[model samples]
Target: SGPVPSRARVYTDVNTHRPREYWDYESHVVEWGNQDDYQLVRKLGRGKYSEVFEAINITNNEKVVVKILKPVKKKKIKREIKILENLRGGPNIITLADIVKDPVSRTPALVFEHVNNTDFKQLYQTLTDYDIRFYMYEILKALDYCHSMGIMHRDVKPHNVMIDHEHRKLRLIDWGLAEFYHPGQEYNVRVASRYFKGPELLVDYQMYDYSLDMWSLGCMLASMIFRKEPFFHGHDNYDQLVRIAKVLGTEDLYDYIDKYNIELDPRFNDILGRHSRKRWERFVHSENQHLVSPEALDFLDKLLRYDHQSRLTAREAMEHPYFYTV
Candidate 1:
């Protein structure tokens, strides 16, 4: 059976009494047309590209999340808006409730139904074992829906998944790196992050699929269950691969290379050829020692396969024993 929902408010009242800063002090409230209808309560958080605030919808007297993008004239922001508009109703995706213009600063604000509680990252830090299971299950469900629609969330991380304690719901957010699959489109080569990147992404940029997201999902699950990143932290991409190779082992990697028909670049050959067998053997033995569960280990193994093509599809992953038990 599923766990019962928590009635307690997830967000603590840290700055409840602080004066509301509608435009974040950059401009007066009047610039956004009274903003009187919706009362700005407090700052929720900030990101690299935008700031989010908690607000009350005056008409219905409900809470909402207002995301204010930095003032930019570039088409990237417009593209992001278009993508959100396209994915509005997806159960796995966050719904964009309304877009409002800040009258004073002339900045666009996106309103969404407030998902009460913490992000997956925060929840992982504080929740019990049962809670982690529930959250991961929901995340997989969302990913399944996304893959069905041919949408690949290039960036899959804990911060992008929000929790609603009242409903025990998990919703995926951040479509900034989303892309529609095409038959002959070149696979995305740009490396995202060392922690969540799959082996294929690190080894060869030409081969990829929606399965990359699955690899990221594995990374996230590992972090939640173990309270640490699966891969060693590196200052750059080259070092990151060394860390990965050190853990996965060269013998296992050779099997993947032959399986995927991968022709390693000169650089990769040079790096892996020297002490590859010894370093990787030690890494594999050490990493496997910290396995979470049989189901989790199986899922992680498949998702983090050195060959991207060998990674499990989201639908197949959802059918695994982990979700069934959860």
Candidate 2:
């Protein structure tokens, strides 16, 4: 007993239009670049999959980000590189400068253009209304480009977005969880960060699509406008749904589940108390009221729907009145 599979409302056949080689990463032969060309300067950060370092490319004498990927399946490495290559040169898409590997031990690292970015927790506080719109529109361009090319950035969060505010530039980075979307394809629901995870992901609906990014965008926008670090503030995956239900209402959640013929995860039975939907206006306190305008609320409402298929597509979201000023 499984839910009837669903497809993305837009850009459903993009992969079908292209040849297999374009979407096939497993067969890709990575022409590794020279390791000596770059020298590590300092450690930037570390994640489950990679250790990132600030480095200087000796050949060009330019700053670059060196992401040394930890030991993982070869297919995962190929997928990330292939997706990056496919998305290369698109607006706001992070540029993959080169791929290098230790010829002896077979440790691989990806070279990327250096972005002078302020941490989002700090940067978001500094953005003006116009600045938020401009950068959000910039993010939409990247999302639309990827979705049009039949790919989804499964993990879309503030940390993955690099902003050089001085230059008014934004780049969506970290494609490790990104994947190509195909019609009727069932994807792993455990993808995005907890706070930004969509209802489709929490409900175990595997047939989600590009709209997932829009949900994450909505969460980011809500956090910025509401001055809440994480809008949903869920403790765990189970409570994540409850947090969402508290806002969107349990009734809508039930409707959405029924629409897809989804069997409710038994774990939700005890904790998911029937709660009425909370109005968006309640979130606008004196502190954040300036940023939380009617237009922002209207746009957020559309993107945070319980039904994933109804959430705005990246292209549509760009044209919403919320971005009209930009």
Candidate 3:
């Protein structure tokens, strides 16, 4: 429901070297006791911020996932550590076991529980509707818990959801974009993965809420069930919006433009602002219409609502009829 007790309390002794201003770039590395505690096995993967690796806990021969930060300014490292500390051990969320100091490279290494299984992306590509419904149910459960705790996981793409080794459970990982909420406070202006980003994020960058994640979940769910991306396979943003307009139809576009109060750039208006509704109607009600389940279509429509305020919350989505039959 919340962070584990052990994770909530800061280990001052263990974090003695950490700086007071956690976001300061200078506070990048915190010293761990000795080199014998962990032994690196092999790299699991690399991301923009860090490289994940398989490691062994020498004291007990236990396995762990180690996330090592790339060389960065002290400020960035501090912010990252602060975020990890706040999100320690939320069930349905990944646990940060320990923070190890790389003796040689002098970089901070984050230890996590070793989760072995395929990511949702690969699972989506291989699994059937029956399997997808089951897996997506678990993912929605995780989202429900996160939202209830006032946490918004900005990144909700398939790659971030991992299956447990037993293949019976789903675990949400990658909290790099997660943020805690304060009543009436606005979230940051950061945009998540382009393909999964909601219309609000793509159009009006400042107006948003946790619903953005739900939108991403919808996109992922559709992509999983359909075995293809819902919108056009555009190489850029302009084309992506055009694809979206094409699928939604013209009347829908005019309604959305007025509803969201979007002031289109003249160039964009020339391409998509005029005759968008007709194009959208032809696409959504035709070829693409028959490709998706009615329930899936309904959910996607709700998710891609032009007005961010009209988007469904994670809890609402979990309770939707789509999951009822699953």
Candidate 4:
């Protein structure tokens, strides 16, 4: 395991300063709600962890999402519940109204506030250059807010970002992979989705922190600016590094691993070559140039660094001149 090399941690205080019970899921007793309170209306989508649905709260006739979790370890389910309670009122977080279980199957479900979201693929198509800047800053606001509370949203992609453009509302959903930040603790690298996986995750760096989310935000922004669904399209976890190195340059990749004393997954060593970091301007075209300014490119550069720690933290990014464009 390429552990924290000096392995600096992020969000150093908010969690450790609290009592152990604050982050302990195993010790806490869960108060489960009746599944009968909510009726499933329709299938919205699904993920590896849960089956999601558009639902109606029978009591209030309100729309919500019923995320019926698949058979996962009990601890995993508990962690999601714990974090949901911990971050409920901060920033643009998705509210977890209740936790219920199917009486028959003994299955646990999460009830979340539903957003009338445009499919991400369809939504990104309609965003003007200023829209990209505005929404991204909102995302940063959520990320920075969570970081302040000592939580890291391990997953940050378009799939997890719900936007209601008509009202200019954005909510960062899916806190399943989110965890409290504890200094020097080794975390699972198998957290983020493939296309948005950061260089640290691909390279087997396990003690990553809030900055990992920062990298994913960078990839998301790049896609919006360049009109690519995934700014980095890695075929396998192995080739994911290949895709990132293509843009960041292999020399910087090599230097990062050297600095961290990290090892490369052998299958990809041959595929990575002497690639140079490409200029952000090269990705600009008549269609996207409106979003590509010197400030925008500079902001993207700071967020997409090969070194995870080198990436701009959410607070620093929100202060960039790119946000002034809006």
Tell me, what's the RMSD of every candidate? 12.7, 1.2, 8.3, 1.5
Tens digit of per-residue lDDT, candidate 3, span 157-275 = 86788786365766788776765543344455555677777665555445455677777887776566556664445456666666666655556656655664666546666666544
In model 4, state the lDDT of residue 227. 89
Question: What is the number of backbone collisions in each predicted candidate, taken in the order shown?
Answer: 5, 0, 12, 1
Candidate ranking (lDDT, best to worst): 2, 4, 1, 3
Tens digit of lDDT per residue, candidate 4, span 179-216? 88877788899988999888889988888889989999
Q: Please name the candidate that would achieve the greatest lDDT relative to the true structure.
A: 2
Candidate achieving higher TM-score, 3 or 4: 4
Candidate 2: where is the Cα deviation over 4 Å? 103-105
Question: Model 4: residues >4 Å from true position, as ranges?
Answer: 1-10
Candidate 1 lDDT over 197-298, as tens digits, reads 776667664445677788788777666656665444655666667666765667777777666566656666667643343322233343343435667666
State the number of backbone clashes in model 4. 1
Sort every candidate by TM-score, greatest first: 2, 4, 3, 1
> Scored by Cα lDDT, where does model 4 land?
0.87
Per-model C-alpha lDDT, please? 0.64, 0.91, 0.63, 0.87
Which residue pairs show collisions in model 1?
A: 31-103, 31-104, 32-103, 32-104, 249-280
Worst 10 residues of 2 by lDDT: 101-110
Model 1 has an lDDT value of: 0.64
| Model 3 spans > 4 angstroms off | 1-36, 72-87, 119-121, 182-190, 229-232, 250-260, 273-292
Two-way lDDT contest, 2 vs 3, winner: 2
Candidate 2, residues 158-186, lDDT tens digits: the string is 99999999999899999999999988888
Candidate 1's error at 2, in angstroms?
Answer: 50
